[PDB]
Design a protein around this ligand. Structure first.
Ligand code: ADP
Lengths: 34, 58, 359, 188
């Protein structure tokens, strides 16, 4: 579980992380080409 | 009342044969001569009140 | 303790998951399309995010996808989202609930149970082990470098319990159960014995691991239905089809195969051979013990006069199978319901025996 | 018999009295004196099956439970209640809190193996207020299936560390078993 414990929190980091810059930056590959 | 009779000119209405509704909001339908179109509904109806196999003014 | 830290971890994951400019971009993606669009069918394709489509009215336009969703998500000859302008591919679609998967795809429980088939066993362990086993506990074969019993065949007189087995397994099974009859494998339209087989097998391969079951595979031969064509040079292919689909090239995968025939003398050896159908199981017609379990099982779930002795019935018929016994069980029911009597009597079974068996 | 009970910091000896008088208080129908012995049950019923006593009175303090031997010893029925189970994880976390350099040396010097001590490890050094080793020298000792090879290498991996480099050294005695341990010690 300790290893498993490290597993969960580690994954939660990205989960927590990913949301961050997500807020920041807020089509063209196609919408242009479209 | 007889003045808006020009309304008849506005256009026509397409009956249609609903293939079935879905997600994203837009009824999937095959009209009649042509074929299948997935198209939005009237605001005055649900998506849920819309079943399969039934006529509706498009 | 860390369990709590583990739980909230699982919870925080749920939040970020649910946690899924853009609105405009999404609207841009809505705006890009048209309200309303146009259905149309795939034909060819090109790395130019465009190919020629196919229409009922049969305009075939060259058109791009509106690209976030994908061309490789789809195959040629498939209905796609098209504008009404150029019929521009606006995206993929979902092959709507066809009328094949439904029919061929028994969802609800099959009833019965592997402790409902009185008088069986080795027949049971043979099937289960060969099929049900490698499906549940499949961890042994992974060490003995063996695989599973490819297909299995069930045969014997009419009432040996072949359909029970197909019914028993499905009762505690966990894989899509495709119930296709061969008799249905005989339509009245040339070159249609090879579509049905492909659709059933194609449907089976899609739903991933599943049980294709063919009860009465014999009916594909031991029968020449009026409305047909070719007479028998057509059924043959349909066999050939079955034989080929149930067999070689590609790589079938997890399609297990269950055939239910009474007479195994009218099966093409190509279907019996192993590879195609390995385990060959027989269903003997009770005797004096199995019947007891069959009788006890069928009369044990009802107000069966504790007076009479299932024995009398067992030693009654000459070689009655596991059906006839059931008919007698039921006969009394109607007898019972007839003279309005919660519990049945002797004659009730007698009339039944003489009412069903004899007649 | 309340007098011999006055000194309640024992690792063990306070146990049986705190089981008997408390069960003597439990069959007696009481929730007062019973708990006072539950804090001070460092074994109440460990081997013997616990009454309504342990479940209630442990956990009542268990959630209340730097450190109070009352709290500390109450759970020394509990962590062993979890050790009698040999499985797994709960009052270790109770222990990780405890910052007692006796218990962590003192608790499981014996008993468990496989997976079992493997997750005792990450608790040993890392989790408590301090860092700990002893079990990983101590319960480590017996390490039957290779003292220690089996579990410690499951420990030598993971914690992308190297402290477990001796652990393999200690067990891995073959040059070539150690050649793998050598690389294993090398790979850190
Ligand atoms: N020994 C038995 N145990 C349980 N059911 C039986 C037994 N014998 C007959 N039956 C019932 O009678 C029916 C006979 O079907 P089946 O065994 O498939 O015969 P056939 O293969 O000729 O169609 C089954 O549905 C089953 O429920």
């Amino acid at each position: 579980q300790v290893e498993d414990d490290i597993q969960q929190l580690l994954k939660k980091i990205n989960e927590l992380t990913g949301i961050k810059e997500s807020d920041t930056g807020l089509l063209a590959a196609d919408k242009q080409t479209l | 009342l007889r003045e808006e009779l020009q309304l008849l000119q506005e256009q026509g209405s397409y009956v249609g044969e609903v293939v079935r509704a879905m997600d994203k909001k837009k009824v999937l339908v095959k009209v009649h001569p042509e074929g299948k179109f997935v198209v939005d509904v009237d605001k005055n109806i649900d998506i849920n009140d819309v079943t399969p196999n039934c006529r509706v003014a498009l | 303790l860390e369990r709590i830290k583990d739980y909230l971890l699982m919870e925080e994951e749920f939040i970020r998951n649910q946690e899924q400019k853009q609105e405009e971009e999404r609207s841009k993606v809505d705006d890009l399309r048209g309200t309303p669009m146009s259905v149309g069918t795939l034909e060819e394709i090109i790395d130019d995010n465009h190919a020629i489509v196919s229409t009922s009215v049969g305009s075939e336009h060259y058109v791009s996808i509106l690209s976030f969703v994908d061309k490789d998500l789809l195959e040629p000859g498939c209905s796609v989202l098209l504008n009404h302008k150029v019929h521009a591919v606006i995206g993929v679609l979902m092959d709507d609930t066809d009328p094949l998967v439904t029919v061929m795809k028994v969802e609800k429980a099959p009833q019965e149970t592997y402790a409902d088939i009185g008088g069986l066993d080795n027949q049971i362990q043979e099937i289960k082990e060969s099929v049900e086993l490698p499906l549940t506990h499949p961890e042994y074969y992974e060490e003995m470098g063996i695989k599973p019993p490819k297909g299995v065949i069930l045969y014997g007189p009419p009432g040996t319990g072949k359909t029970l087995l197909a019914k028993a397994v499905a009762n505690q099974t966990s894989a899509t159960f495709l119930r296709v009859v061969g008799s249905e494998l005989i339509q009245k339209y040339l070159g249609d014995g090879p579509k049905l087989v492909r659709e059933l097998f194609r449907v089976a391969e899609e739903h991933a691991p599943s049980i294709v079951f063919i009860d009465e595979i014999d009916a594909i031969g031991t029968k020449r239905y009026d409305s047909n064509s070719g007479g028998e040079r057509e059924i043959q292919r349909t066999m050939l089809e079955l034989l080929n689909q149930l067999d070689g090239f590609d790589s079938r995968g997890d399609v297990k195969v269950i055939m239910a025939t009474n007479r195994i003398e009218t099966l093409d050896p190509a279907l019996i051979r192993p590879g195609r159908i390995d385990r060959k199981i027989e269903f003997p017609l009770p005797d004096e013990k199995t019947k007891k379990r069959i009788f006890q099982i069928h009369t044990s779930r009802m107000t069966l006069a504790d007076d009479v002795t299932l024995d009398d019935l067992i030693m009654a018929k000459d070689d009655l199978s596991g059906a006839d016994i059931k008919a007698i069980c039921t006969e009394a029911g109607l007898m019972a319901l007839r003279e309005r009597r919660m519990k049945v009597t002797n004659e009730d079974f007698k009339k039944s025996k003489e009412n069903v068996l004899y007649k | 018999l309340k007098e011999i009970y006055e000194n309640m910091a024992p690792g063990e000896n306070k146990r049986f009295a705190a089981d008997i008088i408390s069960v003597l208080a439990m069959t007696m129908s009481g929730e007062r004196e019973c708990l006072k012995y539950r804090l001070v049950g460092s074994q109440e019923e460990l081997a013997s099956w616990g009454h309504e006593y342990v479940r209630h009175l442990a956990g009542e303090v268990a959630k209340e439970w730097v450190q109070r031997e009352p709290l500390l010893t109450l759970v020394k029925e509990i962590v062993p209640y979890n050790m009698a189970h040999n499985a797994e994880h709960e009052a270790c976390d109770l222990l990780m809190e405890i910052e007692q350099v006796d218990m962590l040396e003192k608790d499981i010097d014996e008993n468990a193996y496989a997976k079992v001590c493997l997750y005792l490890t990450s608790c040993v050094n890392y989790v408590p207020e301090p860092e700990n080793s002893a079990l990983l020298r101590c319960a480590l000792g017996v390490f039957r299936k290779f003292s220690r090879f089996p579990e410690a290498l499951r420990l030598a991996l993971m914690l992308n560390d190297m402290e477990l480099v001796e652990d393999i050294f200690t067990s891995c005695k073959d040059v070539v078993v150690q050649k793998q341990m050598a690389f294993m010690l090398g790979r850190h």
